[model samples]
Target: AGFQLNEFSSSGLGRAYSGEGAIADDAGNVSRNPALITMFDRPTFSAGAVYIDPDVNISGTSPSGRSLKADNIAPTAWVPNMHFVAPINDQFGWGASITSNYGLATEFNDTYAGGSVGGTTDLETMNLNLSGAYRLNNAWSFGLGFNAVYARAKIERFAGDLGQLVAGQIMQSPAGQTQQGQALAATANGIDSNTKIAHLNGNQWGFGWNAGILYELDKNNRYALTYRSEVKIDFKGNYSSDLNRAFNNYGLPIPTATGGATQSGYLTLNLPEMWEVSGYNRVDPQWAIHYSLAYTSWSQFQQLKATSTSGDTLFQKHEGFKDAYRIALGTTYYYDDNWTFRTGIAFADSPVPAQNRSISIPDQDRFWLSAGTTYAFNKDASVDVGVSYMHGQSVKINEGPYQFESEGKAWLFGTNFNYAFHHH
Candidate 1:
């Protein structure tokens, strides 16, 4: 219901409202719930946008009670989603959607560097899904879908800018080497270069299946339950020749291809699993309630593994993550013949373990509070406004060198346009 922590890829409807599928993914997008296609009973289109702002803080404590600030990362992001549907032969329907169901963004500044956590890092992820549905009857429906995901990641460090300093001298320097005045001087005078930055970009594929069942107790109300299977994505990409050479030449513990300075490689990850249960009830002529509960197996994603074409491990493994859940409650109030107001609230937990938390993604427990409104213009056209705020309980940063002392916050604002070519 809430951002589901891991699902807050983009501010889009997916992040603004979690009761449904991805921001653009509908009830049938994943589960072919054929019953939902006829329920809408019209050709339709929907588009939505969202704005996200995240604030994070970090700090450290010395042996002499010397407190230093380590956390200082924030970003304002804009994300959107779109979906359209069409009907054929009364029982067959198909649709497509552009939405981000799973992803994240984390970075650090050059001045704020960490040994293995924060540093100057950049990352981006994206996904597009296609769906089809087949109606079986009033009480049963099925759906099928797949997605293409694109991912990119990078990290930049500057303490090694000194091109003149030999690798041996730099290697001799220990952690927090900047505090060593002579070492910093040797690195600054072009004595040797310590700057290390690597870039990676790749693509992956994932497929999912869903089924929904709705039972009618009367003419005006029903209960719905849906289940979606998980998908795994095997990402394929390579390291820059320059990047491979630098790290390899240094003779770091990281594996290498003989005396070579460069190589090619790929990474893999198992996107989490999801399960949701929802219901609809009409309380009056213009009032209705939509409630939902969901669970995700982030635990399935215990680690991110990387392997090279030449049998080398370029990246280390990441472990200790846990599963997460979502609980939501929403209600809609119809206004006469052309408008509807909607409001909802949700609470969720973080899947990232505190011990494994890094500045690149030092995530923590969070709460999401949201509200919105939808207006139907003459039944054939409508627009909606939605917004949400994410507050993270201040998390401690015992990671790398960039440590955090307190808390952080992330917010989102969005609007949607819905158009239905109603056939009388």
Candidate 2:
């Protein structure tokens, strides 16, 4: 339903993405604040990628009192980013960047009791940006940027009452333990008498903007404030499938269409907005510190809705998501002239409420621990590498006849290279 990843920048990863609007240590940091580009006096290019590995699983009891477990369903991903900054003059700067801002991938085993809740889903988006910054004076700078995003998503679900259907067919079969006959009977009865599946998919292009202000008290201390507007992405794609077809044939009150059943059309979703304020302070010639406070407007995500071509509402839910926050602290130490060390820690709150949690997204409060290093190839080129580990709180779900316990842990490895062109 939402997207969260650890691929912003190799240099920032160790700091848990702290100093979003303040620390402009490298060109990649511009993705957090376009004003950061003004920190580079020369033309610069930065490129990097992050590989994520996740371990997530759930265990619980179904309505039928069946004990089950869904294991490691979330897929691993590799995310990439690129940024180029062009200094038009001492007072003006412009740049371009390609970043993946939102994404999700998860797949549950078919044997899961609530497979119909969410068997599989994928959402991915890439944002291309153009930015410009103007320095009002030696101590102040303002930046603005525009973004164009391409998004795609897919969702699939299996019948939740498959076990009951299988049991029914077993009794109707000839002799003893006729698994094959039972399966055949179920398939002939309906697409998912116990196996029928439902699917929904969509894609779209959206636009948005971001702005930031950077203030400097001295060469060793600074602060930044930034905001990114929410983009309303109008997704138009196919919507088909239902789990109650068999129930209707059996005269069960499954509550479907008016005079029978017939409905198909598009789905809609809202990408949330976010804001950050970051600061940097130098303790001495060899030490510096960074921190940030961030907020996400997840309350806007009231629900996920689907509609028919005739403008009829097909499905929707009250998500009951609240706004969330994050706090981070990072430090850097000079270990010599050509090398530096960095480390950071951060804590983040989940927006999804326990009452509204689903297999599609069981995210909970999480913590991150990170570290990294930089090697200067020369005065014009440098390489940065970072590693991070994140752990989520164990989340328990109790909605309807479903009770599940879920937990997640992830690891990330990142690498980046930056080259600064001729400078005065």
Candidate 3:
């Protein structure tokens, strides 16, 4: 789920969300199947927003071989969603949602040259959900949900060109003939390649749970199964570095603390765990179709540790993730009653592999195309608009002495508004 965030709503992003847990058509589908709020019969509200334009790029060679590039390093984002559903009768129902699955923001160019390992990375997350539903008759239905999540992260790294190759290996070691190793090799050669060799800032809060099951066979066919659970923050920030005073004053024992000191850390994240299976069909009377299959457990995300408060081990990457998949297909058309249309296609897979690509997560493998439309305005209100395009593939990375070649693309635009409230 590489930085997951499926721009929820906008009529399920025009179907690229393929049957978002059995398309219940609005109330934001109860944020992906809260038993679809028992197909809401009244009381519904949906709101949306999405706009993400990414163009990640990175060209290789550094580790002193110079020549590097960093264009559009991931940025431009906006994702918002809201949902509300209510039924409370007909076997009960309830819902509420405000979304965001995961996020990321990247930036590089503080004297880039792969600034240490590419600088600036920001992560943010938010999710608030509450759901409940149960039908149990006429082809079952059941759902449950609860989630509250909020996360934040910030990271920075610099000292490009490896700080003049560690100040020419500290003036050719042998303590470069004394004088405190030539004043620590002129203080690591006046350190500047955008200095600031490391930093982090954090925030946290986590909780999770979700469940769903629905199967119809009588309401134009339906099926869905969903699950989501996994949230483990623990940010607790504050970390600074300067390579433990330039490798322990070039004597190298690496005990951290001496230049740019600052400690007190914690970093343990794992916000994965997902599942989905969807289907929906309407055939004739305006046509419809949908599909979905998903799974994510990014292998518990192998590594990215950071600990300190004396237990040392501050900062560790090693992201050897694996376990990801997604598939989607969609279609819809209704016309003649306030226009409607849709389109879809999807494919995703790539839990970083390329010997664990990284430049701040340049994971690839993705493809999607979508389209959407909807306009009602009567019988309660309507509006929907969607668009999508994503393509990423072109990867090759090798941290450690840097060496990259990445590429990415993205563009999504969404809009939403739906309302229904008619009681008697």
Better structure of 2 and 3 per lDDT? 3
The TM-score, computed over Cα atoms with residue i paired to residue i, of candidate 2 is 0.88
Off by over 4 Å in 2: 162-196, 242-264
lDDT of 1 by residue, 190-265 (tens): 3212233333456656555555554545545655555655666666775432233433556543333222233465
* TM-score of each model, in listed order: 0.78, 0.88, 0.39
Error of 1 at 122 (Å): 5.0
User: 267-321 in candidate 3: lDDT tens per residue?
Assistant: 8989887999999999977889998898988888788788888876766677878
Best by TM-score: 2
Model 3 residue-pair collision total = 0
lDDT of 3 at 134: 93
Per-prediction backbone clash count: 24, 3, 0
Q: Is candidate 1 or candidate 2 better by TM-score?
A: 2
C-alpha root-mean-square deviation, each candidate: 5.6, 4.7, 14.6
lDDT of each: 0.54, 0.77, 0.83
